[PDB]
Structure formats: structure tokens, C-alpha cells
Paper text:
Recently, it was shown that SARS-CoV nsp16 acts as 2′-O-MTase in complex with nsp10 and selectively 2′-O-methylates the cap-0 structure to give rise to cap-1 structure. Here we report the crystal structure of the heterodimer of nsp16 and nsp10 (nsp16/nsp10) with bound methyl donor SAM and biochemical characterization of the stimulation mechanisms. We found that nsp10 is required for nsp16 to bind both SAM and RNA substrate, and the crystal structure shows that nsp10 may stabilize the SAM-binding pocket and extend the RNA-binding groove of nsp16.
Within one asymmetric unit in the crystals, one nsp10, one nsp16 and one SAM molecule were identified unambiguously. The structure of nsp16 exhibits the characteristic fold of the class I MTase family, comprising a seven-stranded β-sheet surrounded by α-helices and loops. Two zinc ions were clearly identified in nsp10, which formed the center of two zinc fingers, one coordinated by Cys-74, Cys-77, His-83 and Cys-90, and the other coordinated by Cys-117, Cys-120, Cys-128 and Cys-130. Nsp10 and nsp16 formed a protein complex through an interaction surface covering approximately 1767 Å2 in total, indicating a very stable interaction. Intermolecular hydrogen bonds exist between Gly-70/Ala-71/Gly-94 of nsp10 and Asp-106 of nsp16, Lys-93 of nsp10 and Ser-105 of nsp16, Leu-45 of nsp10 and Gln-87 of nsp16, Tyr-96 of nsp10 and Ala-83/Gln-87 of nsp16. The adenosine moiety of SAM is stacked among Phe-149, Met-131 and Cys-115 in nsp16 through Van der Waals force, and polar contacts also exist, such as those of adenine N6 with side chain of Asp-114, N1 with main chain of Cys-115, and N3 with main chain of Leu-100. The crystal structure of nsp16/nsp10 complex shows that the SAM binding cleft of nsp16 is composed of three loops: loop 71–79 (residues 71–79) together with loop 100–108 (residues 100–108) forming a wall on one side of the cleft and loop 130–148 (residues 130–148), which is followed by αD helix, forming a wall on the other side. Both Ser-105 and Asp-102 of nsp16 are located in the flexible loop region 100–108, which stabilizes one wall of the SAM binding cleft, and consequently promotes the SAM binding activity of nsp16/nsp10 complex. In the crystal structure, the SAM methyl group stretches out to the surface provided by the K-D-K-E motif, which are located at the bottom of the central groove, and might bind the first adenine nucleotide, conserved in SARS genomic and subgenomic RNAs, as the acceptor of methyl group during the methylation.
Numbering used by the authors:
A (entry chain A): 3 to 294
B (entry chain B): 9 to 129
Write the structure that this text describes.
Amino acid sequence: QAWQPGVAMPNLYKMQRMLLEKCDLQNYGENAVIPKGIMMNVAKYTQLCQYLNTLTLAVPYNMRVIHFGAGSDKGVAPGTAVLRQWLPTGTLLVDSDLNDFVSDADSTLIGDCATVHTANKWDLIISDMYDPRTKHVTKENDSKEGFFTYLCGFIKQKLALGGSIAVKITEHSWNADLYKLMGHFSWWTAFVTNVNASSSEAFLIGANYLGKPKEQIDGYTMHANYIFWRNTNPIQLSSYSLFDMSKFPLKLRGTAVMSLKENQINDMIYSLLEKGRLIIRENNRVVVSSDI
Amino acid sequence: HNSTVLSFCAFAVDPAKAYKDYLASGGQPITNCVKMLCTHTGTGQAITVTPEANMDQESFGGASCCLYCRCHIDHPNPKGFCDLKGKYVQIPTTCANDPVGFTLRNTVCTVCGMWKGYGCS
Ligand SMILES: C[S@@+](CC[C@H](N)C(=O)[O-])C[C@H]1O[C@@H](n2cnc3c(N)ncnc32)[C@H](O)[C@@H]1O
Ligand SMILES: [Zn+2]
Ligand SMILES: [Zn+2]
């Protein structure tokens, strides 16, 4: 486990029907396994990408990736820099944040995510959005809206079939509809980076979007399941995986992209999507705008 | 103190000279340049599409090491061009404490692709 980029929520825990409890994790100081001159977020995104390398991501010749919540207090975009490193050269990478920052993305959009519009579909959506103003361990823990409502809509409207997502959540920062949407992928988890394993943070990862239910997930229940897993399975901090970057870059799969009608999407092509040897979207000029 | 250095340079007629003066005054170099995890088996060239640090360098995200990006001011390049943003910069490890200053003070060899005086020829 220590050698892995992190730990994914086991099937056994996904399958429970737990009541929602408080998360008993806390995250002191200070990131004990981050190498001396490296940002936590560089380490975190590196392990996220390492984990994504283990899955059946579709990687088209002209891949499109959009990254929400890419800014930071530092005025720079560490996660974007890691994604740029990981993704194939020439990959279109657009990032965004409420607050101004400088980044290595091809385009950067400043503003609330709700102001971001695009008619084009995407192959991979990454979100590290998090509201700095929600209270830590308190009264109740209901499903959160805000940017989460936007993401659910964006996924449903703007994610290509076969595409994938990774969305940051925590004990308190989560949304029931997002969990439900996980049931519309070929596969999902549940991923905690080894470098931040003392935190209730995880990335909800949906691999190979199917645009229709594959399983019926209840969000309130699944988050309770997630919390129960975290509560009963301590994970020791580890940066082992950071010390071998030789196989880091996302594999150049040359994944077919096709525009297909609903009536053309049969069992054979669903199986390609699940495998994931196919992306279904148009290939029009990409226009992403922040207005207004 | 980062807020200050960035503003100090952003509101100078010659931001690069201002950064130099600021440093000579004992001011701290610009922080939060984004250091990448990498093999240290790269080509060692100055500015590359992916991290290319050799055993004597660190690789940083380019935009974070550019004074003009970081200060949110115009670049000195003829048109709207930054040679660092979107790319990675290899910085000698001995100079890794001040990547922005390094890129300001030095020049890339047009034949080697390596930093003049730090690996070129
Ligand atoms: C934990 S920080 C992300 C750090 C960043 N991913 C990195 O690589 O260092 C959370 C970010 O989400 C952003 N955010 C929160 N709500 C947002 C919203 N509604 N629209 C756009 N960005 C939002 C915040 O501005 C903040 O920059
Ligand atoms: Zn620049
Ligand atoms: Zn030379």
C-alpha cells in the first residue's frame, strides 16, 4: 500500500448502506512526507495522475482537458503544472478559478465556475474546487450545492462519452447528485492520495462516461459509506511513489474519436466505451468563454 | 513579503532592474515557483515542453518563474509573447532558490538550447 500513489475505496465499502457519521480524521502539521522543496499540491496531483495511469482513460490524438479550481492562495497553479506535465504534448488544457492566478494552461478563465460556458465536449474534467468558507466539523452535514451543482450540469452536458472525471471532495465538501452521477460511468471510486492520507479529502473518479445509468447510487448513502471507510481504515502517509517518475506521462493511446447518433450507439460501442477505446464527441473548434 | 516584491517590480519603469535592486537591498527572492517531480535524467536544456532537468538542475513550471507573468504586467517581447508560460524551465540547483531572478539574469544559447554559462558548449 505504501508504494501505491494512494488508496481507492474498496468495493466492500461501496456496497454498504451506512448511516452518516462524523469523520474522525484530523490533519495536523505539517505534511510530513512532502519532499523539501515540493508543494503539497504538486505531490497530490502527481499521485492522482499516477493513479489515473492505472485506469482505462481514453486519450484521443487531440485531447481536451478542463481543470476547475486551478488557482490558489499562492497566485500560481501547481495542479495545472502537473497536468501539463502528465498529458500528451499539444493536449488542449483549459483551467479556471474564481480568483486570478498565473498558469501553464493554454487558456485560463477567471470567474465563478457558473460563468464558464462552452459548446464543446471534453475528454477529461478535473476539479479541485473547494469553498474556503464552509465550517469544519459542525452541526449537520447536508449535501452542498454551489459549484457542485455547476459540475453536475457540466458533466451531463459537456463530458464526451468515454471521457473521465476526478472531482475533489472532503467530509463536508460533497454533493449527493455528484455521487449519483458516478453511477453513469463504466467504473468509479473513491481515491485518497498517500501524501494527504490524514485528510478526509478524496477524489471522486468516474472512468469512461456512459451518459446513462449503469448502477443506482444514492449520494447520501454513498458518502456515509465513504466516511465509514475513512473512519475505520487509517492510512499512513507515504510519498514512496513520488521517487520514481520514469513512467509518469499519460500513455499515448491514440483513442478513436467519433461523432455518433443515439441510434448508432449499440452494445458493441458501449463495450468500446467501457474499455475505454472510444470517445464520442464532435471535433469543432473549441471556444471557452467566461461571461458574464 | 511576496505581495510587496511583486508590486515593487510591477510599478517600476524597469521591472527587471527593480527586482535586481530589490534583491541587492536584501529582499527575499520571489517564492512559490512551482518545482516539478521528475527523473533527473533529462536533456538539461533551458526551456522545454516537459521537465528536462539533469542531475544538476530542478525543473519548474514556466509561468511561475516569469517575472512578467507573476507581476501581471506586459512582457518585454515585441508582441504578446512569453517564452516560459506553458513550458518548463530548468534551473541550476545552486540557483534554485531564485528561479525568477535566474531567468531574468541569464540567456539561452540559440544553438545549444542550454543556459549560457551553465551547460552551454
Ligand atoms: C484548494 S484550492 C485549489 C488549489 C489548486 N487546485 C492547486 O493546484 O494548487 C480551491 C480553489 O477552488 C476555487 N473555487 C471555489 N469555489 C469556486 C467557484 N464557485 N468557481 C470557481 N472556483 C472556485 C477557489 O478559488 C480556490 O482557488
Ligand atoms: Zn511570462
Ligand atoms: Zn550553446
